[PDB]
Amino acid sequence: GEIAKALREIAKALRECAWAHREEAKALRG
Amino acid sequence: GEIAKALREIAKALRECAWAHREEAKALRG
Amino acid sequence: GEIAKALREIAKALRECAWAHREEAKALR
Amino acid sequence: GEIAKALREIAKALRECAWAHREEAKALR
Amino acid sequence: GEIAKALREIAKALRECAWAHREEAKALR
Amino acid sequence: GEIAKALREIAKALRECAWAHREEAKALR
Amino acid sequence: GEIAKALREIAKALRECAWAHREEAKALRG
């Protein structure tokens, strides 16, 4: 369904955000 | 659908958020 | 619809967040 | 509707989030 | 309804996040 | 219902996020 | 259901964000 697909897009975008936050943590402690 | 379109807009906005965080992680290094 | 409008308000608020996060990165460099 | 109203509550909270992030950006300078 | 109640819990959690971001900004000053 | 349960999971994950942001704030100062 | 499953994927991604933030906090302290 279109609605379920769009919710999965939201999840994927948040997994992007998480990756970016993990990079901030690594850049900080370095 | 209007609801699905709006959910995709939320996703797009979160992808903008992730890009911003990736830039923060880059800035934090140098 | 009222639900779709509210979801668009959520999207807009997140675009505000992204602009702010961008300004944080600029302030860092 | 109560669902639309709750979704608007979520957007309002995210606009709070953005305001605070804009304050972080100002503080980093 | 259960769905509206859960959405409000989501907003409540984001207000917590906003309060934490205001605190981070405060620490940065 | 499963949708309400999943929304409550999102709320709980955001409360996790808020706790972590509070830990960042603390670590800052 | 597909919608419920997608919503749980959003929650999973946010728990990923939380883990990353807990790592950022550990890095700020050292």
XYZ file of C-alpha atoms in Angstrom:
206
model
C 0.000 0.000 0.000
C 0.992 3.595 -0.664
C 0.587 4.526 3.001
C 2.712 1.610 4.225
C 5.348 2.429 1.582
C 5.511 6.034 2.723
C 5.863 4.958 6.358
C 8.776 2.722 5.319
C 10.331 5.764 3.630
C 10.067 7.586 6.933
C 11.822 4.684 8.695
C 14.597 4.616 6.112
C 15.115 8.378 6.478
C 15.443 7.873 10.243
C 17.994 5.098 9.686
C 19.857 7.745 7.681
C 19.654 10.105 10.631
C 20.973 7.413 12.963
C 23.968 6.760 10.711
C 24.707 10.473 10.637
C 24.488 10.698 14.453
C 26.869 7.736 14.755
C 29.308 9.697 12.616
C 28.978 12.706 14.898
C 29.880 10.516 17.899
C 32.926 9.163 16.063
C 34.059 12.640 14.970
C 33.627 13.905 18.542
C 35.711 11.250 20.277
C 38.636 11.671 17.870
C -3.531 9.859 -1.801
C -3.193 13.060 0.203
C -2.223 11.127 3.338
C 0.465 9.088 1.542
C 1.806 12.235 -0.136
C 2.044 13.978 3.243
C 3.865 11.012 4.792
C 6.357 11.139 1.916
C 6.854 14.854 2.693
C 7.720 13.909 6.273
C 10.257 11.399 4.922
C 11.786 14.015 2.630
C 12.103 16.386 5.571
C 13.858 13.723 7.645
C 16.258 13.035 4.758
C 17.049 16.763 4.921
C 17.656 16.336 8.644
C 20.098 13.471 8.011
C 22.012 15.471 5.410
C 22.295 18.265 7.968
C 23.653 15.801 10.574
C 26.158 14.347 8.083
C 27.344 17.928 7.627
C 27.630 18.320 11.403
C 29.730 15.142 11.576
C 31.972 16.521 8.818
C 32.249 19.863 10.622
C 33.104 18.129 13.905
C 36.175 16.524 12.330
C 37.537 19.678 10.697
C -8.336 16.530 4.804
C -7.601 17.432 8.404
C -5.320 14.432 8.852
C -3.307 15.162 5.701
C -2.996 18.837 6.691
C -1.701 17.873 10.129
C 0.822 15.511 8.564
C 2.005 18.379 6.335
C 2.403 20.480 9.490
C 4.613 17.719 10.827
C 6.680 17.766 7.621
C 7.046 21.540 7.808
C 8.179 21.376 11.430
C 10.834 18.836 10.429
C 12.023 21.114 7.627
C 12.423 23.737 10.366
C 14.507 21.258 12.302
C 16.697 20.572 9.279
C 17.382 24.273 8.726
C 18.334 24.605 12.375
C 20.632 21.553 12.245
C 22.273 23.074 9.166
C 22.911 26.260 11.160
C 24.506 24.160 13.902
C 26.939 22.652 11.381
C 27.765 26.094 9.982
C 28.408 27.402 13.500
C 30.774 24.471 14.107
C 32.857 25.407 11.065
C -10.950 14.899 14.884
C -8.943 13.644 17.830
C -6.430 11.996 15.486
C -5.810 15.189 13.495
C -5.585 17.134 16.754
C -2.966 14.711 18.118
C -0.989 14.983 14.880
C -1.027 18.771 15.241
C 0.283 18.262 18.797
C 3.184 16.329 17.306
C 3.942 19.138 14.863
C 3.780 21.680 17.688
C 6.305 19.653 19.681
C 8.597 19.461 16.664
C 8.398 23.227 16.208
C 9.552 23.391 19.826
C 12.399 21.086 18.874
C 13.405 23.369 16.006
C 13.305 26.457 18.222
C 15.658 24.771 20.666
C 17.983 23.682 17.830
C 18.068 27.289 16.563
C 19.153 28.174 20.097
C 21.911 25.550 19.972
C 23.116 27.059 16.685
C 23.214 30.506 18.299
C 25.088 29.131 21.324
C 27.743 27.353 19.243
C 28.847 30.794 18.049
C -9.311 6.301 21.052
C -6.187 4.181 21.367
C -4.633 5.623 18.204
C -5.157 9.256 19.226
C -3.847 8.445 22.712
C -0.665 6.913 21.286
C -0.131 9.905 18.998
C -0.390 12.200 22.032
C 2.223 10.041 23.791
C 4.447 10.602 20.768
C 3.981 14.374 21.081
C 4.707 14.180 24.805
C 7.977 12.377 24.079
C 8.980 15.027 21.556
C 8.346 17.786 24.106
C 10.797 15.860 26.319
C 13.266 15.924 23.456
C 12.768 19.683 23.023
C 13.353 20.274 26.718
C 16.576 18.262 26.468
C 17.726 20.313 23.461
C 17.036 23.568 25.346
C 19.222 22.135 28.112
C 22.029 21.319 25.664
C 21.868 24.891 24.359
C 22.034 26.113 27.946
C 25.147 24.004 28.567
C 26.761 25.395 25.409
C 26.480 28.974 26.679
C -4.756 -2.917 18.290
C -1.526 -3.419 16.397
C -1.412 0.130 15.009
C -1.828 1.709 18.460
C 0.795 -0.677 19.862
C 3.247 0.312 17.129
C 2.600 4.002 17.754
C 3.294 3.396 21.450
C 6.602 1.789 20.420
C 7.490 4.948 18.520
C 6.708 7.015 21.611
C 8.880 4.796 23.765
C 11.759 5.059 21.287
C 11.470 8.851 21.411
C 11.606 8.703 25.208
C 14.838 6.728 24.725
C 16.060 9.536 22.501
C 15.177 12.186 25.074
C 17.097 10.348 27.805
C 20.125 10.173 25.546
C 19.909 13.902 24.711
C 19.755 14.615 28.447
C 22.937 12.556 28.789
C 24.596 14.656 26.083
C 23.558 17.855 27.868
C 25.064 16.527 31.101
C 28.276 15.410 29.392
C 28.641 18.866 27.836
C 28.873 20.584 31.226
C -0.654 -5.601 8.842
C 1.658 -3.681 6.519
C 0.918 -0.352 8.205
C 1.588 -1.654 11.730
C 4.763 -3.329 10.495
C 5.948 -0.104 8.874
C 5.253 1.806 12.084
C 7.354 -0.698 14.028
C 10.140 -0.097 11.511
C 9.945 3.595 12.372
C 10.268 2.714 16.059
C 13.233 0.441 15.331
C 14.968 3.265 13.462
C 14.360 5.657 16.334
C 15.861 3.174 18.788
C 18.856 3.271 16.434
C 18.910 7.060 16.778
C 18.774 6.707 20.567
C 21.760 4.347 20.600
C 23.727 6.821 18.488
C 22.838 9.664 20.866
C 23.941 7.571 23.858
C 27.259 7.165 22.031
C 27.523 10.922 21.431
C 26.960 11.524 25.149
C 29.722 9.036 26.030
C 32.057 10.825 23.599
C 31.363 14.291 25.019
C 32.368 13.012 28.455
C 35.398 11.404 26.815
